[PDB]
Design a protein around this ligand. Structure first.
Ligand SMILES: [Ca+2]
Ligand SMILES: [Cu+2]
Length: 638
């Protein structure tokens, strides 16, 4: 199931208007409180007018609207289920502006929802752009509109939430398709559940930021239910999705052909492991006792030989947390970062940090404990870790809880500074820690090197939406300060994701995936950071990268760019992938620019591919006002 975020508005005084209605299936049968009566657009002898079809509700007075729900016809007939759709709000009834929500609902008779940030309105319009199975009609048995207890304008300067993207699945795993800019998402063998999977199937969905279109398809070609996997973008530009519900399978997503290709089986069955791309483009993984059984030492994927090779001396024991549930949880979601000379740094969640090595049959060396002058940091299962300055080896870690479940989260946060593999990194506390203790939260590094932190809950109860944290935070390293941003209204805890979009906004979605529970979130929202807004709250003018000398570069190589205005800073941000709070693909390189004069600039990609990990990267430039360009895609090879 799912649920609205608000409380249903009384429909006594309501008036409705529809583009077309068949006798006996009048527009007002969608608001009569009877599940057995439905509005249905014109059909039969005199015509079957095709969508878009529209229903507009005049609520008579201004209400603090934060959602709507649609109950499909309940007579066992599929005709008229709404597929692609848009939701619009108005106070006058003539000017509708931009949709507050848009996307595509799954093709079945369950109640569908559009949940979105509170906005005062008297009129609510639902546009059914397509019927879920491509037929001409629209039908609705019951439509409801929901309200928040109050409305508060967003605070100036603290970013903005919206719109909502309605989806046909809960996006519990997601990646950016770097060659197209689309967001790729997947759930499990079904749209709302992973429990009782027979394996061999994953439902996926994609959203195109440039057009707003949502699609969906069924991945079976790789015979892999990809729920609870490792995810890494390898050096050949393919996303390696390892294990999960089909605990030994590997599937490869190719952005260029937008297709899934079978990969080699892993040597060890795993689920909830982290995997990390290495300096040579290979993928290292370790742990993962959610599925498959024993100690899960490391193994390495080679895209050139198409093999997984066991690294049994890359021992998982030093990175286990003290989870009260034991092995099932204690090797999960390692905070892995590819680093110099084939090494992988493990920053947590265990107190003990470790260096993993991939030469020979593998190795592990203690890197000391995550700690500060406030003490030794406790285990932080489902805390996050973000490499916001790869050149200086800077990792920000934050949140999480000592146990996977039934454990209080903390405000702990640290800055880890990596040097050479095998040396114990310096670790300090980050400012005074988070504003809000949270676990199951997600995070992304932004073009300006700040880290955006959102969602989670204060006490980890997977699939329950209790103690939610609605206020995101941004860490600004130059000030060693956290800043609360404007809050959202949708809980984003267990099974949620966040990704940085090429346009510099943040895509935050999912949560739930528990079948009959009411806590499934079939949606995502956009967060627009303050750096995209001017002083009056309007979208700022953005610098444009008018030309680049090349789109593919070897580490140590030079790139020259031309812009339409002078730029004060630039960064490269590696494209991200996300599930279960893990994103081992994103990282940021601040660029040292040579000013060529005439709004022409040059920079060198770092020569160490343990810093500039091979794969796809976003080039962002920022003007003097701090506004970033949209990203230019750069392929980095080694
Ligand atoms: Ca009805
Ligand atoms: Cu899970």
């Amino acid at each position: 199931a799912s649920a609205p975020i608000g409380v249903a508005i009384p429909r006594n005084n309501w008036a409705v208007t529809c583009d077309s209605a068949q006798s006996g299936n009048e527009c007002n049968k969608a608001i009569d409180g009877n599940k057995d009566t439905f509005w249905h657009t014109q059909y039969g002898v005199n015509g079957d007018p095709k969508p878009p079809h529209t229903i507009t509700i005049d609520m008579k007075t201004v209400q603090n609207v934060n959602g709507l729900s649609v109950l499909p016809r309940q007579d066992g007939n599929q005709n008229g289920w709404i597929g692609r759709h848009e939701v619009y709000l108005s106070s006058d009834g003539v000017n509708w502006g931009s949709p507050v929500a848009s996307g595509s609902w799954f093709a079945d008779s369950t109640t569908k929802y559009s949940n979105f940030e509170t906005r005062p309105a008297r009129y609510v319009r639902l546009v059914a752009i397509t019927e879920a199975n491509g037929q001409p009609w629209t039908s609705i048995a019951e439509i409801n509109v929901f309200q928040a207890s109050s409305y508060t304008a967003p605070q100036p300067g603290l970013g903005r939430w919206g719109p909502t993207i309605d989806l046909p699945i809960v996006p519990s795993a997601a990646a950016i398709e770097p060659t197209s800019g689309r967001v790729l998402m997947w759930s499990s063998y079904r749209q709302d559940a992973f429990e009782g999977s027979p394996g061999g199937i994953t439902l996926t969905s994609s959203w195109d930021p440039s057009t707003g279109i949502v699609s969906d398809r069924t991945s079976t070609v790789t015979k892999h239910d990809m729920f609870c996997p490792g995810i890494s973008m390898d050096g050949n530009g393919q996303i390696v999705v390892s294990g999960g519900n089909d605990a030994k399978k590997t599937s490869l997503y190719d952005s260029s052909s937008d297709s899934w290709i079978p990969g080699p089986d892993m040597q060890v069955a795993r689920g909830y492991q982290s995997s990390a791309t290495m300096s040579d483009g290979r993928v290292f993984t370790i742990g993962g006792s959610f599925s498959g059984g024993v100690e899960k030492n490391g193994e390495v994927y080679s895209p050139s030989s198409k093999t997984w090779t066991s690294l049994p001396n890359a021992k998982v024991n030093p990175m286990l947390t003290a989870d009260k549930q034991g092995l099932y949880r204690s090797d999960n979601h390692a905070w892995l970062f590819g680093w110099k000379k084939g090494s992988v740094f493990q920053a947590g969640p265990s107190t003990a940090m470790n260096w993993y090595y991939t030469s020979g049959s593998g190795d592990v060396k203690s890197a000391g404990k995550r700690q500060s002058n406030r003490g030794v940091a406790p285990d932080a299962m489902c805390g996050n870790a973000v490499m916001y300055d790869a050149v200086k080896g800077k990792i920000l870690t934050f949140g999480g809880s000592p146990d996977y479940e039934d454990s209080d989260a903390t405000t702990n946060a640290h800055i880890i500074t990596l040097g050479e593999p095998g040396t114990s990194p310096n670790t300090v506390f980050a400012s005074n820690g988070l504003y809000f203790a949270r676990t199951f939260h997600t995070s992304v590094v932004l073009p300006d090197g700040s880290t955006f932190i959102t969602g989670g809950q204060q006490r980890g109860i997977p699939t329950e939406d209790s103690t939610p944290v609605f206020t995101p935070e941004i860490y600004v390293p130059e000030q060693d300060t956290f800043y609360k941003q404007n809050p959202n209204s949708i809980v984003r805890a267990y099974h949620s994701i966040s990704l940085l979009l090429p346009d510099g906004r943040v895509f935050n979605g999912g949560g739930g995936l528990c079948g009959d529970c009411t806590t499934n979130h079939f949606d995502a929202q956009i967060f627009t950071p303050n750096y995209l807004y001017d002083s009056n709250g309007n979208l700022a003018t953005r610098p444009k990268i008018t030309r680049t000398s090349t789109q593919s570069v070897v580490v140590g190589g030079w790139i020259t760019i031309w812009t339409d205005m002078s730029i004060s800073a630039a960064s490269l941000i590696r494209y991200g992938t996300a599930t279960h709070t893990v994103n081992t693909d994103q990282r940021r390189i601040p660029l040292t620019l040579t000013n060529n004069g005439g709004n022409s600039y040059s920079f060198q990609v770092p020569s160490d591919s343990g810093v500039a990990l091979p794969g796809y990267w976003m080039l962002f430039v920022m003007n003097s006002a701090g506004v970033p360009s949209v990203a230019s895609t750069i392929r980095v090879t080694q």
